[PDB]
C-alpha cells in the first residue's frame, strides 16, 4: 500500500530500522511494517510492569496504596521522581505513575521487584496471551539495545495487540484498565514522538522508550474525536551504538499513518 511505501521511504531516509504496528479498532484492520521483527523495548516495557501490578491489585485490593521504601542504593541512572522521595516511601500507585509518566527507572525496578523479578513481568505477558514479550533484565541494563540480542525485546505486532488488550480490552479489571488509561494519557515524555505527528485534537496516551543504538520508541493508544480508537506502536533503532535519538522518525511515522484514516 501507499502507507507501506511511505514508511519504507521514511526508514530509508532515516538510516535505521523502523517497526510499526497500527490496529484500527473500527474494523480490527492492522498495518504492519517490520511487524514481526524484534526490537529493544527500552522503557516501553514499563507498561507491562505497571499492568502486572494492576493485575495483582484485582485480588489485593489495597496493593496500590502499599508504601515502598526508596533508599539511596535503589537509585539508578534516571530517577526524576524517586529522587524526590529518597529516604521516604512511595506507594505502588505512585511508583507506577512515575514509571509511566516520567519514565523513572528506579520506579520500574521497584515494580519488577514487586513482581518477583523480570520473570514475573514476562509471566504476566504470557498470562494475557503475549508469547513474544520478554523482559530479561532490570534497569538500566535492559536498554543496551544490542543488535541481534533477543533480551528485552518484543515485536511491533505483539506489543500493539497487548497494548490494545490492556487499555481497550479486558485483560485488566475495569478500575485497573481505567487507571492505566489515565496514567498513559498523563504521560509527560511524549510530546515530540507519536503525538507530534497527529492532529492536536486527538487524545493520546503513550509510553516512550529510548536506549543505546539510538533506540527511540513510542507506543500509544489514540482516541480521535468521533472515531474508534487506534493503537500505534513505533519502534526505531540504529546501527551505531552512540547514535542520537530520533523522535522525529516516530512523529513522521505517525503522520504517515494518520494520512489514510
Q: How far apart are CA 225 and CA 229, in angstroms?
A: 9
SS3 at position 255? helix
Residue with cell 506489543: 159
CA dihedral 120, 126, 128, 133 (to 10 degrees): 90
DSSP 187: -
**Cα 251–Cα 255–Cα 258 angle in degrees, nearest 5:** 135
Phi (first) and psi of residue 90, to 5 degrees: -130, 145
Question: Of residues 1, 13, 14, 43, which has the active-site annotation?
Answer: 43
Quick check: 155 and 185 in contact, CB under 8 A?
no
Grid coordinates belonging to 143 = 536498554
| CA quadruple 234, 235, 239, 241: dihedral sign | positive
Sheet holding 230-237, edge to edge: 29-33, 17-24, 230-237, 215-223, 203-211
Ramachandran bin of 141, using left for φ above 0, alpha for ψ from -120 to 50, beta for the remaining angles: alpha
Q: Answer yes or no: 252 catalytic.
A: no
Mind telling me the catalytic residues? 43
Amino acid at each position: 500500500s501507499a502507507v507501506q511505501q511511505k514508511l519504507a521511504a521514511l526508514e530509508k531516509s532515516s538510516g535505521g530500522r523502523l517497526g510499526v504496528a497500527l490496529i484500527d479498532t473500527a474494523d480490527n484492520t492492522q498495518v504492519l511494517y517490520r511487524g514481526d521483527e524484534r526490537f529493544p523495548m527500552c522503557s516501553t516495557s514499563k507498561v507491562m510492569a505497571a499492568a502486572a501490578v494492576l493485575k495483582q491489585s484485582e485480588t489485593q485490593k489495597q496493593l496500590l496504596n502499599q508504601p515502598v521504601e526508596i533508599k539511596p542504593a535503589d537509585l539508578v541512572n534516571y530517577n526524576p521522581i524517586a529522587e524526590k522521595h529518597v529516604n521516604g516511601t512511595m506507594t505502588l500507585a505512585e511508583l507506577s505513575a512515575a514509571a509511566l509518566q516520567y519514565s523513572d527507572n528506579t520506579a520500574m525496578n521497584k515494580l519488577i521487584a514487586q513482581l518477583g523479578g523480570p520473570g514475573g513481568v514476562t509471566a504476566f505477558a504470557r498470562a494475557i496471551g503475549d508469547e513474544t514479550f520478554r523482559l530479561d533484565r532490570t534497569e538500566p541494563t535492559l536498554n543496551t539495545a544490542i543488535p541481534g540480542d533477543p533480551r528485552d525485546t518484543t515485536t511491533p505486532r505483539a506489543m500493539a495487540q497487548t497494548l490494545r488488550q490492556l487499555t481497550l480490552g479486558h485483560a485488566l479489571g475495569e478500575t485497573q484498565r481505567a487507571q492505566l488509561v489515565t496514567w498513559l494519557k498523563g504521560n509527560t515524555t511524549g510530546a515530540a514522538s507519536i503525538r507530534a505527528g497527529l492532529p492536536t485534537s486527538w487524545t493520546v496516551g503513550d509510553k516512550t522508550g529510548s536506549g543505546d543504538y539510538g533506540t527511540t520508541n513510542d507506543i500509544a493508544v489514540i482516541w480521535p474525536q468521533g472515531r474508534a480508537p487506534l493503537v500505534l506502536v513505533t519502534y526505531f533503532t540504529q546501527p551505531q551504538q552512540n547514535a542520537e535519538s530520533r523522535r522525529d522518525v516516530l512523529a513522521s511515522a505517525a503522520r504517515i499513518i494518520a494520512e489514510g484514516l
